[PDB]
UniProtKB/Swiss-Prot annotation:
Tissue specificity remark: A major expression is found in the colonic epithelium. It is also abundant in the activated macrophages. Expressed in fetal membranes.
GO cellular component, one term: immunological synapse
Parent-record interval covered: 113 to 250 of 250
Alphabetical keyword list: Acetylation, Cytoplasm, Differentiation, Disulfide bond, IgE-binding protein, Immunity, Innate immunity, Lectin, mRNA processing, mRNA splicing, Nucleus, Phosphoprotein, Repeat, Secreted, Spliceosome
Protein function: Galactose-specific lectin which binds IgE. May mediate with the alpha-3, beta-1 integrin the stimulation by CSPG4 of endothelial cells migration. Together with DMBT1, required for terminal differentiation of columnar epithelial cells during early embryogenesis. In the nucleus: acts as a pre-mRNA splicing factor. Involved in acute inflammatory responses including neutrophil activation and adhesion, chemoattraction of monocytes macrophages, opsonization of apoptotic neutrophils, and activation of mast cells.
BP GO terms, sorted: eosinophil chemotaxis; epithelial cell differentiation; innate immune response; macrophage chemotaxis; monocyte chemotaxis; mononuclear cell migration; mRNA processing; negative regulation of endocytosis
Phosphoserine, modified sites: 76
Protein name in the entry: Galectin-3
Source domain of life: Eukaryota
GO molecular function, one term: carbohydrate binding
Location in or out of the cell: Cytoplasm; Nucleus; Secreted
Motif extent (Nuclear export signal): 114-129
Occurrences of domain Galectin (ranges): 6-136
Binding site for a beta-D-galactoside: 69-75
């Protein structure tokens, strides 16, 4: 597999029609997973499944600018399960990142960072065994 945390370079940043696919398996007794689509030190799109926040499972998404986190967007639909294989697809669309897990739509996150072509790295971290991470233009 791959070593987590893993860095996937996104040459020339992201663009509408670019699809990022992450395959892996959640560790037993997981606490968190995180995708960090980075513009330099800023995080344009942070996707953070939390497996135990006050005994609830929640996906937290946010942007970090100049080292400050913004206002979080939260989703109680939670398709992940400890110990199980998953696929995350992030499709960049004109106004938002669209995320599907295991072929089912999960959430959309509107672009806050506007310089999409400078979002040049995806960091993948957390309690997972990472099998593959790649992109294709669709
Ligand atoms: C570091 O604290 C925070 O920014 C917030 O802290 C509160 C608790 O007071 C709560 O945990 C919020 O979820 C965040 S935690 C923070 O959240 C960002 C995304 O908003 C990232 O996941 C980061 O890794 C977390 O530490
Ligand atoms: Cl919620
Ligand atoms: Cl910007």
């Amino acid at each position: 597999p791959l070593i987590v945390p893993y860095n996937l370079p996104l040459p020339g940043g992201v663009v509408p029609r670019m699809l990022i696919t992450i395959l892996g398996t959640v560790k037993p007794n997981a606490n968190r997973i995180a995708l960090d689509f980075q513009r330099g030190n800023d995080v344009a799109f942070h996707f953070n499944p939390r497996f135990n926040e006050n005994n609830r499972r929640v996906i937290v998404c946010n942007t970090k600018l100049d080292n400050n986190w913004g206002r979080e967007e939260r989703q109680s639909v939670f398709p992940f399960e400890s110990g199980k294989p998953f696929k995350i697809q992030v499709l960049v669309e004109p106004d938002h990142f669209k995320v599907a897990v295991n072929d089912a739509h999960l959430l959309q996150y509107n672009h806050r960072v506007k310089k999409l072509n400078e979002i040049s790295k995806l960091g993948i971290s957390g309690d997972i065994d990472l099998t593959s991470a790649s992109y294709t233009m669709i």
